[PDB]
Swiss-Prot record, chain A:
It catalyses: RX + glutathione = an S-substituted glutathione + a halide anion + H(+). Residues 1-79 form the GST N-terminal domain. The lineage of its organism: Eukaryota, Viridiplantae, Streptophyta, Embryophyta, Tracheophyta. Its main location: cytoplasm. CDD domains: GST_C_Tau (cd03185), GST_N_Tau (cd03058). The keyword Cytoplasm applies. It is found in: Cytoplasm, Cytosol. One of its GO terms (cellular component) is cytoplasm. One of its GO terms (molecular function) is glutathione transferase activity. Its EC number is 2.5.1.18. Keywords: Cytoplasm, Detoxification, Transferase. Gene3D superfamilies: 1.20.1050.10, Glutaredoxin. May be involved in the conjugation of reduced glutathione to a wide number of exogenous and endogenous hydrophobic electrophiles and have a detoxification role against certain herbicides. This is Glutathione S-transferase U23.
């Protein structure tokens, strides 16, 4: 038995969705209302009270990148996610960590803030895009020739690019064509296609929030 | 060849020192002046420009918990650090992540700030202590019956406890005896004994800065 507590537009939740589908395991997806969190969510992640929460045979695993590695280590022979080489594996972990650290606050402020905080966030996220663009280089994936951990770690953000462009006056699509091509590559995988919500859906939800709350 | 670029009182660098010694590998330690970073440091960690940086056969590995896992995966049979069970491994990673996330800002502010910011930091770090104390519970180690990843992730902070008590007016030693006993346990390992600097030395270094 596998349960995933998640939020549809969560790029972190999307990672675990993708990892589960890469392994072709069946699981129960449960949508959480983050303004009205379930007893199960609070019981299973008392420390952070965040989604995604992966519940396997009744036991909780928290933090999306830790969940992906957990899923990979349980089913290593089906669509291996992490490299087998320790050095390459260390590098994949580094770049997933980089994404987590650099996007957590700015990407929240991109859609939830205006004024000075949003401005700061724009600068930081553009810096992330430039850095990831440089790291990707001319490879098909962050993982080189094949879809890997860092691809999983960032692809969910693609579903937000249009939102960031519209609500934060960013230019992403025309400025980072290698990243757009990479995203198009990843989207051909059924795991990714299933996990990522429609970009217009995200945009509509975020603009609604900004109208009503701001 | 293994080079470690580090700063002696860095609790993060201490993790990698410990992991290397757990595996009994020889390596070159290089002390970095963090106010005057070496060209090697800037070349090898251009993204964060932080220590510890582990350089193996000329190739850099950054972030201490990632370095520890790298070292564990290179030499898995000598004093294994991470659990072999995937779920237990996930939990070890979770608690090392918890420590990284909750200590990064407060522990810097404990000695570098005053007023409202230091007060906030004290509140946050005591919460970390209480949470880890609860997680440790009655086990000998965070890793259970044996020294493991989370023990490595936190043990370096012990060498700063006296500093926090003195410069932030915190009470740690008298308030968290299970954590004190745990640290005594860890200190019996040669890796930990080598890595952790004297508590008064750390305090002196911070007092100069303040
Ligand atoms: N580091 C976490 C971040 C997860 C996260 O931020 N989840 C958000 C949804 S996108 C959340 O649950 N927020 C709930 C809250 O903070 O109240 C991970 O990688 O899983
Ligand atoms: N997340 C990093 C943190 C390492 C870190 O913060 N290192 C400090 C020394 S304790 C540093 O290099 N500071 C550089 C500076 O102050 O510019 C890790 O775990 O290795
Ligand atoms: Mg062990």
């Amino acid at each position: 038995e596998i349960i995933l507590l998640d939020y549809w537009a969560s790029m972190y939740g999307m990672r675990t969705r993708i990892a589960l589908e890469e392994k072709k395991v069946k699981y129960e997806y449960r949508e959480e209302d983050l303004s009205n969190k379930s007893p199960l969510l609070l019981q299973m992640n008392p420390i952070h009270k965040k989604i995604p929460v992966l519940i396997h045979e009744g036991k909780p695993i928290c933090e999306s990148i830790i969940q992906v590695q957990y899923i990979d280590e349980l089913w290593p022979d089906t669509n291996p996610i992490l490299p087998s080489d320790p050095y390459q594996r260390a590098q994949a972990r580094f770049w997933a960590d980089y994404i987590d650290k650099k996007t957590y606050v700015p990407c929240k402020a991109l859609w939830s803030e205006s004024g000075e905080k949003q401005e700061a966030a724009k600068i930081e996220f553009i810096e992330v895009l430039k850095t990831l663009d440089s790291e990707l280089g001319d490879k098909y994936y962050f993982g080189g020739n094949e879809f890997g951990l860092v691809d999983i770690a960032f692809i969910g953000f693609y579903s937000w690019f249009r939102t960031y462009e519209e609500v934060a006056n960013l230019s992403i699509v025309l400025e980072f064509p290698k990243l757009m091509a990479w995203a198009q590559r990843c989207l051909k995988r059924e795991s990714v296609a299933k996990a990522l919500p429609d970009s217009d859906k995200v945009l509509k939800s975020v603009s609604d929030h900004r109208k009503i709350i701001l």
